[PDB]
């Protein structure tokens, strides 16, 4: 596709260091500062049960596919204005592709 496909092993370090302070590793997994990312791909924004999302995150209502996903990781507050997702962003294409590849496999 336009997004390559590469790393499940390398994105595991990128996830554990840049996301795991919230982002969980299992289904039924807890929401913390942020939601459990299981079943994220193929689901709309702001749909995970038991969590309180900002109006802006549910409002944006976009289906999370690998492409609009990497436009969100580059700058979270420009794609969804008003989001409480306190993250600077992945400025490198390799970093985004490697992580989406891990997220495609881990959030099955």
């Amino acid at each position: 596709t336009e997004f390559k496909a590469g790393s499940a092993k390398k994105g595991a370090t990128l996830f554990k260091t840049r996301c795991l302070q919230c982002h969980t590793v299992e289904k039924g997994g807890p929401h913390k500062v942020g939601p459990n990312l299981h079943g994220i791909f193929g689901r709309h924004s702001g749909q995970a049960e038991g969590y309180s999302y900002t109006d802006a995150n549910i409002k944006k209502n976009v289906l999370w596919d690998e492409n609009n996903m990497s436009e969100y990781l580059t700058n979270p507050k420009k794609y969804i204005p008003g989001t409480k997702m306190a993250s600077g962003g992945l400025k490198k294409e390799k970093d985004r592709n490697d992580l989406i590849t891990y997220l495609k496999k881990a959030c099955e």
Partner: protein, 294 residues
């Protein structure tokens, strides 16, 4: 004799446009070298650098401060309280060799301002003019604060930096950035989850979390939460004191008031002990990398 007077002299024929360029080179390397400290970036070590080079000030005799840029000399460089900051200097020297005209103090302080602004924080007015002083003006170690203390210490410590209750609570909000490293200070773990984005998380986590006092692997005592975070004794003391507690509460409700007060305080901290002539330029407000299309 009265204290020494440190007059701010603008670098020979330099203006806003020249400093905006120094900012951009830093802000870009902040975006480029994003691998450091398990992807927190060099953002926090830069604001901690600007604070330590300015934290050496003594209002009584005007010694220390950001002016002299004395952090380059072995004595202050090797301060046990400046541990880990060597990484902030290695990040800035390739940028100093690209702009050899800029003074050391101007660079370290500009590093702090660039980092806060880039980590989506408030706009911090910055002034040029700091001039390099020699090895004999380098402040003797231990002027910086101890973490294993209480509210009474914090209040009397900052009095030396000419800071009031509202200023120190505001300045402490910069702890929303980064972490404490065991190999550096004897304390381990972050204050929040958003380690590289300037928010009021510090205050929220202070009052909203479940704090239990434990000991770490360096045998020092710190407050840990179930969420995996931490707070230094000086941090926790902000909710123990009744006067500091009502300001911690205010910033937890209003982030825009916090952003308004930090910028006033942080600027003051970096400009402490520097005299600006009346012919000197009005403070610069730098454009972020996002504001210029990057």
């Amino acid at each position: 004799t009265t204290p020494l007077v440190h007059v701010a002299s603008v670098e020979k024929g330099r203006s806003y446009e020249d400093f905006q360029k120094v900012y951009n080179a830093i802000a870009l390397k902040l975006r480029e070298d994003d691998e450091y400290d398990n992807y927190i970036g060099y953002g926090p070590v830069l604001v901690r650098l600007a604070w330590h080079t300015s934290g050496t000030w003594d209002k009584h005799d005007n010694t220390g401060g950001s002016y002299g840029g004395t952090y380059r000399f072995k004595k202050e460089f090797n301060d046990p309280s400046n541990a880990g900051l060597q990484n902030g200097f290695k990040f800035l020297e390739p940028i100093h060799k690209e702009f050899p005209w800029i003074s050391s103090g101007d660079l370290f302080s500009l590093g702090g301002v660039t980092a806060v602004q880039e980590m989506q924080g408030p706009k911090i007015p910055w002034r040029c003019g700091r001039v390099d002083t020699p090895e004999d003006t380098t402040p003797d170690n231990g002027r910086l604060p101890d973490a294993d203390k209480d509210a009474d210490y914090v209040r009397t410590f900052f009095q030396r930096l000419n800071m009031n209750d509202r200023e120190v609570v505001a300045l402490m909000g910069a702890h929303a950035l980064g972490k404490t490293h065991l190999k550096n200070s004897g304390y381990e773990g972050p204050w929040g989850a958003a380690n590289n984005v300037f928010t009021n998380e510090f205050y929220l986590n202070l009052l909203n979390e479940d704090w239990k006092l434990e000991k770490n692997d360096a045998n020092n005592e710190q407050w840990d939460s179930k969420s995996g975070y931490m707070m230094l004794p000086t941090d926790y003391s902000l909710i123990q004191d009744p006067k500091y507690l009502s300001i911690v509460k205010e910033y937890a409700n209003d982030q825009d008031k916090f952003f308004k007060d930090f910028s006033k305080a942080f600027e003051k901290l970096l400009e402490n002990g520097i005299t600006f002539p009346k012919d000197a330029p009005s403070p610069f407000i730098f454009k972020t990398l996002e504001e210029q299309g990057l």
